[PDB]
Structures are given as C-alpha cells and as structure tokens.
Amino acid sequence: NREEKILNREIGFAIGMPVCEFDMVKDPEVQDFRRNILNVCKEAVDLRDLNSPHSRAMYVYPPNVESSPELPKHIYNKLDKGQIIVVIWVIVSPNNDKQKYTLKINHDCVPEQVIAEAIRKKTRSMLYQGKYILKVCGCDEYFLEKYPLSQYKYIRSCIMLGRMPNLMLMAKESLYSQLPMDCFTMPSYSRKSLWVINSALRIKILCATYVNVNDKIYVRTGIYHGGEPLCDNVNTQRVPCSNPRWNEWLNYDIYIPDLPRAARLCLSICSVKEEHCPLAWGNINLFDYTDTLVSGKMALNLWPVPHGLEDLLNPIGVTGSNPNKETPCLELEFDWFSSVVKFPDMSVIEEHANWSVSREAGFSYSHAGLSNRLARDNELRENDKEQLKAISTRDPLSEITEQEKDFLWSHRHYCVTIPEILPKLLLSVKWNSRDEVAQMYCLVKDWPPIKPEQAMELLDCNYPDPMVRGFAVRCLEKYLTDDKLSQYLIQLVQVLKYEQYLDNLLVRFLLKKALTNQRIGHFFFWHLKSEMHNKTVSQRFGLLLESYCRACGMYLKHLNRQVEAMEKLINLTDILKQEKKDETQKVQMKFLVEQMRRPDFMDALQGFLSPLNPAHQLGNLRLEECRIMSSAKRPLWLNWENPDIMSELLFQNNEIIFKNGDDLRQDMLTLQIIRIMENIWQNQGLDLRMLPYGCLSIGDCVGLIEVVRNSHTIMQIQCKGFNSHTLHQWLKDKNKGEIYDAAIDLFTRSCAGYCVATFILGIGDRHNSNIMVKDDGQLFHIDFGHFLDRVPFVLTQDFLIVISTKTREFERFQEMCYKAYLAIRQHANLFINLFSMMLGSGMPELQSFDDIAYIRKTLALDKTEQEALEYFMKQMNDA
Numbered sequence: 001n002r003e004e005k006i007l008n009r010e011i012g013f014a015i016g017m018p019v020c021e022f023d024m025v026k027d028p029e030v031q032d033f034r035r036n037i038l039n040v041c042k043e044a045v046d047l048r049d050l051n052s053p054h055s056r057a058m059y060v061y062p063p064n065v066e067s068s069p070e071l072p073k074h075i076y077n078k079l080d081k082g083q084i085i086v087v088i089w090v091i092v093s094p095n096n097d098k099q100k101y102t103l104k105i106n107h108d109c110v111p112e113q114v115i116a117e118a119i120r121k122k123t124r125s126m127l128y129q130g131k132y133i134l135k136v137c138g139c140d141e142y143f144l145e146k147y148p149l150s151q152y153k154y155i156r157s158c159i160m161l162g163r164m165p166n167l168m169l170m171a172k173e174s175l176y177s178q179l180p181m182d183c184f185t186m187p188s189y190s191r192k193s194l195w196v197i198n199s200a201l202r203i204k205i206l207c208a209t210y211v212n213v214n215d216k217i218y219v220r221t222g223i224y225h226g227g228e229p230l231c232d233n234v235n236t237q238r239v240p241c242s243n244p245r246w247n248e249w250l251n252y253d254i255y256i257p258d259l260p261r262a263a264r265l266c267l268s269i270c271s272v273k274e275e276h277c278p279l280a281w282g283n284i285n286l287f288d289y290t291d292t293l294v295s296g297k298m299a300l301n302l303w304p305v306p307h308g309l310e311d312l313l314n315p316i317g318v319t320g321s322n323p324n325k326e327t328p329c330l331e332l333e334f335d336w337f338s339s340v341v342k343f344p345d346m347s348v349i350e351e352h353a354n355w356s357v358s359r360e361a362g363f364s365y366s367h368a369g370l371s372n373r374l375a376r377d378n379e380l381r382e383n384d385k386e387q388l389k390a391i392s393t394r395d396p397l398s399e400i401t402e403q404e405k406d407f408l409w410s411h412r413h414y415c416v417t418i419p420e421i422l423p424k425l426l427l428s429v430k431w432n433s434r435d436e437v438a439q440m441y442c443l444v445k446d447w448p449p450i451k452p453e454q455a456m457e458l459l460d461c462n463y464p465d466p467m468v469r470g471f472a473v474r475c476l477e478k479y480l481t482d483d484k485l486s487q488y489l490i491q492l493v494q495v496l497k498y499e500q501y502l503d504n505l506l507v508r509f510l511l512k513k514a515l516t517n518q519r520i521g522h523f524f525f526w527h528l529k530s531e532m533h534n535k536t537v538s539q540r541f542g543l544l545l546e547s548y549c550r551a552c553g554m555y556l557k558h559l560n561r562q563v564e565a566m567e568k569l570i571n572l573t574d575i576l577k578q579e580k581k582d583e584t585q586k587v588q589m590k591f592l593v594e595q596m597r598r599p600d601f602m603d604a605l606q607g608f609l610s611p612l613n614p615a616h617q618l619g620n621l622r623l624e625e626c627r628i629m630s631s632a633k634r635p636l637w638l639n640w641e642n643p644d645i646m647s648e649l650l651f652q653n654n655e656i657i658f659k660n661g662d663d664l665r666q667d668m669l670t671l672q673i674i675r676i677m678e679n680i681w682q683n684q685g686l687d688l689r690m691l692p693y694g695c696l697s698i699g700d701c702v703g704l705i706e707v708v709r710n711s712h713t714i715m716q717i718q719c720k721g722f723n724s725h726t727l728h729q730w731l732k733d734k735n736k737g738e739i740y741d742a743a744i745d746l747f748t749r750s751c752a753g754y755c756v757a758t759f760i761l762g763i764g765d766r767h768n769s770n771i772m773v774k775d776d777g778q779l780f781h782i783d784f785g786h787f788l789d790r791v792p793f794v795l796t797q798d799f800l801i802v803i804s805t806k807t808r809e810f811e812r813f814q815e816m817c818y819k820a821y822l823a824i825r826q827h828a829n830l831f832i833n834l835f836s837m838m839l840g841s842g843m844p845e846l847q848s849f850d851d852i853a854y855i856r857k858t859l860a861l862d863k864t865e866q867e868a869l870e871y872f873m874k875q876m877n878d879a
C-alpha cells in the first residue's frame, strides 16, 4: 500500500539495509520468526491502545522511578523533618513568563498531590482540577504515575545532591496534543518418530571446498550441550592440504534418544605441523527450530577463528552457516531414519519422567551393583542437609566436583527447598541421559521462582536447555522492574547470542518490554543496531530490529534522525583523521564550518534526541563551542543548545564527545558496573558518590561520551596554578566558607568509591590525566582502557592532604573503603554473572572464564569475611 511502502523505507534506514532483502531469504525459520513474532507486537500496541491517551503517554514518557519506594537512612535524614522543598514553575500569558511557586511537602507525595499544593499556592498568590501533569525543567521526563515523589530518580538525586527540584506544571491536553494517531498494520509476508530410534549417533564428513594453499588437515568434531561435551570428541583422518575429501563416518558415544534438546555438533577444520591449529569453525543444532532431528546431506560455511581461541573447537560460538559463501565449506551427512524424527512433546517426556522415577525406585532395591546417583528417602542427615546449603552459597566460578554432582543429584527432591541451588543442580545433571533430563524437566516445571539477579545466571553460555532458560525468562517476567531491566539491558541483549533459535521466550520478553517502554526501546534499538556490523548477529539482530521498528510507532522517525546524525559524524571524522589529519585545528574547524553550510549536514547534526539520553533534545549546533580534539583518533567535542523552554534550570548547553576509532564496549561495561556498585553502597546506607557518565557504542569502534560539566583533570589543577599541594587550595578556592566542609566530605566519599571499584575490577593505570575533579569536590575517573588483565588508584600525598595520615578523617576514610569492599564481596555472584553474559561479546579483555576469575581473587571468595578484610587491608598499605 501507500503507508506500507513509507514504513519499509523508514525501517530500512533504521536497520541500515532494505526490508526486501529479508524476504529474499529462503530459511523457513527467518520467515517463521518474521510472522510468529507479530503477536508480541500486537500485545504491546494493544496495551498502549488500552487506556489511550494516558497509556500512550506512559509508553512514550515512562515514569523514571527507582525500584523501591523505601529510602535508605542517610537519604531520609537529608529531608527537613521528612519533608522536601520543591519548586513548581508556570509558563504564563502570551509573553511565556516563567513564574515559580515554592513548596515544602512530604517526600512521599504523589504527583497529583504535589500539583494540588501548587494550585493552592497559585490561588493564594493574590489574597482548577487535576487536568495537569509535572515535567522536569530542561528535559522530557514526566511524572505521569502515582509514585511517591521521592521514588522518581530526579527527586531522589536532588535529595542526595542537596539540590532543590525544579518541576514545570503543564496541561495534560498540551502533552496529548504531541502524541500522534499511530496504527499497527499486518505486513504482506504474513499472508514422525520420537525415542523409537534404537541407534548410536554417527555423522559423515563428506568433503571440504574453498580450502586450498598457504602439512596435513582434518575435521575435529564434538557433541556439546553448552560448552560441555556430551561424549569424547571424534576427529577425521589427516589429509593433504588442497585435496579435502574424507567420506568418513564418525561414531560418537551417544545413543540418539539420549541426545538433550539443546545438543550441538561443534566442528572445526584443523591444520597439523605437533602444532594443531584451527583454520575455520562452525556449530550446528542437532534439532531444528521445529524440534525435527537433522537428517541427510548438509553444507556448512565456516567462520574465521575468533582472535584468542582456547582449544581446536568453539562450542560457545554462534550456530549455523556463515552468510559469506566464499568461505571453507564443509559438506556433511546425517542418518535418515524411518521418517522425520521429532523430539517428543512435553506430555511424552512427562510420562517417561514418571516411568523413570518408577524404574529408578525398583532398580535398586533390586540392583546388586552400586549407584551414587539413585534418590534415597529418609536417608538425608542434618549434617549433609547443612553441607548442601554450603554448596548453594558458593560463587558461580567455584568448581563443583563429580562427587558433589552425584551428591546434589541424589538430593534433587530436597534441592527444591533451597531454590537458589538450581544452577548447581542443573550442572549436576547427566545431560546425555534422557532418563535424568526428563526428571529434571518436571523439577524445573514446578521450581520455586528465584530473584532476577539469580535468574540471569541461567541465561549465560552454561545453560542452553530451553526449559532452564524458559524458567529464567519466567522469573524475569514476574519479578524484574523496568529500572532493573534497563540496568542489565546490555547483558540481556548479549545472551540473545546463546539462543539456539530466532524465536525464544527471552526475545519475546525483551521485545514486549521494548515496545511498552520507550526508554527501554531506545537502548534496545541502540544495543542491537551497534552490532549490525558483526555478521555472526546481523540476521538475528536485523530481524529483531525489523519487528521492533514495525511496531515502535512515531519513535522510528526519532531513531532515523539519530541514525542520520551519527552517519554524518562518522563521515566527518573519517575525512579529518584520513585527509585533513596533520592540518591545523583552524583549517579542520573551517572544514566543519564549511560542511555545516550544507543543507543535508545542518539538518542531520541538529534537532534530534541524544542517543545517550533520549530525554535530551539537541537543538542548534553551537560550532563556536565545538572543537576537534588533540587525541590520535581526532574525536569531536560537540556542543548543542538545550531547546527546552526551561533549559537554564538544568543545563543551557549539552556537550557530547563523539569518538571514532576505539572500542567503547569496555568503558560501557565499567561504567555500568560503577552504577551498580554505587547503587549497592547507597542501598546498604553507605554514601560513596560515583559518576557513571554516559558512554554508548553505536557501531564498530564508534560511540558517544557524556561530558561532565565543571570538571578538570588532576593534571590541569596541578599545571595551571612538579607540584604536590595545589589541589586542596583549588578546592578551598572553589568552595570557600561553610561550603568547604561539604566539598572535603564529597571528595573523600567519592575518592573512597573509586579506590575500591578500581582495585576490584583491576582497571587500567590511573594517573593525573586519567582522574577528574568537579567544582564541588566530586572526584571521578575516566577512560577505563582495560579491566582485570594491584591497586591502580594510588592515593598520593596530593589526595591525602585533601582528606584533612594519622588524622581522624583518614580513620573515617579507611572505614569507608572497608565497609564498601565488604558491600561488594556480599554481591560478588551478581558481578561474576554480569561478566559471564558478556563472553559472547567479542571483547579481548573478557574472552574466557579465566578472565572473570580475577574478581574471585581481588574479592577473596575462597577466604572468610575477616580474612578477605585482612586481604584488602594488606593490599591497601602497599603503595
């Protein structure tokens, strides 16, 4: 139609490839995902059309609230008798006069209540009903829901900062006048035997093509469930280099009905010299998306080995053929049985599980042989019930012995009483034994829900089973707040890579939330779009992006304006670091200024939302405040006017650093971990102010960085002014009076926060230029080069003098680092889980579980609470 043709050009621009291309794809799964996902779209749109227009407003401007309405002790204490002084603004008459009405009201007042007092003060300022809404002055953040005022992140941040909230009052009708009439349309594309196989698995390696020049070669194979072999790996015969025809059947120690649902064939072409090397790799799901077992002739196009691969295989790697067909192509053959073999229905598995529990009970009783895996009733002693608990308290990095596994499995029915043990019991299963797997399925089917922070662990590369991942999704669906879903969004987008198929419970969950919360949808779009360059995820992420863009609504027009901006800056910074690299900042700036005269450039680089915070409107480009930086990759310091009616009450200008050349993924993760550490310390009552500024990767070593206003590096404070006493005097000068005592306190609390953080994460070398200080004393670190692969933030005499060595303030400071280290140690399981989910991300500083182990060392998990306290105590004295 007319609208369908306009939509597809808009979707195409957003993804970076035309939609017609997805149709010219003959994979039934691709076309099934495309059609079968459409109900997740339908449900999301329906929820937005439910309480229209209010429900459409909640979509476009979701309330930005904290997870709990409860405030910590140190936060509540800042309120003058549990009450907050709030400032409500009104835009009066035709001359748009800003008029403030100050209040002092209960921090837990709902926005409809706050409005009432503001109308009461307006009616009294001389001596209406609820057709109004509250907005943050200077940004598009609204207060459309009945939450305690202190629950909104702006209000809580204000309390924390000792800043007075500035909110603007406006008509509900004036906001709804900005929400357009969106319509969802149905696209043009929308309109056996089971365990009866009494046989062992064999796979024929026929031949290899596109394998030529540059001693011998072979095909290394293995059958895997996650990253664990379901039997021993089987190699083909060694063969001369250019001639690769094996025509060999490989015979595996697995009986076909014993194959788990998420069983994979993991293969690689290896070179020999004593020194075996993988040339290419590829993995195949033994069952297709429809539960059908792979049969017959097949050809798999192979992938290049990832930089820094362990063994000769890549089990954690992507499944399916490499799209580039000019690559090593391996031709295989699978046994064809009586008909089309299909994995049994849940009911057949349910009956076999009941049969297995029965045969298990009458097995021994009447066996004669010994079994450490048979379940025994009444034989569970209180000293071993307390030993089972000690297992559940173990970190995800800790090794679980074969004895502990047999122990855990014989107690599989008790385990249901310690629900947080499940990841360990799931590892304890003999995943190559249909008998135990059918039984495990029924346990999960009725397993007590676990916390989302625990659920997430069952979504890394170790838990491939659809039932295990389905239960994890179910725990998130019911217990994960939007605040928290937003906080862990980069790991949830990352673990999508561990999914066997396009259509799954996780993608369905993530997409429903994306299409019912625009703040989630923004970052869901950007985290997906930023990996379109990566061919390993291009199709899955592209299809996910198509389904998103097809139902997001008018936000696509906003996303496309953002895409056009980043594309211009990439083009711009390409020319500077290529051609005009050694040219002066005046000539380089003359080129930018000449390019800004161009219409396509002055439309693109102005009047669009900030990808770091879509609540921020980037108006006119103030070139006069922009500069090409001195850094090697020629990054841009960019300055935009804040076109908000009340910009002045937040920030009149918005500064973003656009960088093209370096990987921002490692900074993205370090800044996320900081936000988390900060939120852990804050929840535990100890106020250690951190600054996880915005950093977003938009592609292949391209991204944006939030500039922190009123900040200078440690070097800049030393330089303009060898010198070791300048910092304190500068902070005394920038905070003279009673204002000084607050600044010294904000420097120590922030200085303590970064001391712990950097130590734990093993962050890159911290110097005078890698550290920064705000006008109020707030200390923060920047450019986190590389983590894990020592105390990097060495407290020099410079920082020590600002603290007040044998002082009362330094005795308070040490007590700040100590509680903080204990606070992170009590949460090490979460941090371990966040890094594990990122293994799939191609990050060099995080390629194996060995890398994550660094935080088991620095957080002394194998030691005790007092022992680890002694570890941090000892490591902090060595400077």
Ligand SMILES: COc1ccc(-c2cc3c(C)nc(N)nc3n([C@H]3CC[C@H](OCCO)CC3)c2=O)cn1
Pocket: 630, 657, 659, 664, 667, 693, 705, 706, 707, 708, 709, 711, 712, 713, 772, 782, 783, 784
């Ligand atoms: C991963 O890549 C990167 C690249 C840049 C930054 C980066 C962040 C930053 C922030 C958040 N806030 C403020 N205020 N400044 C900042 N800077 C400035 C440092 C001083 C410099 O001054 C000129 C040379 O001395 C101007 C730039 C940065 O570089 C961080 N990570």
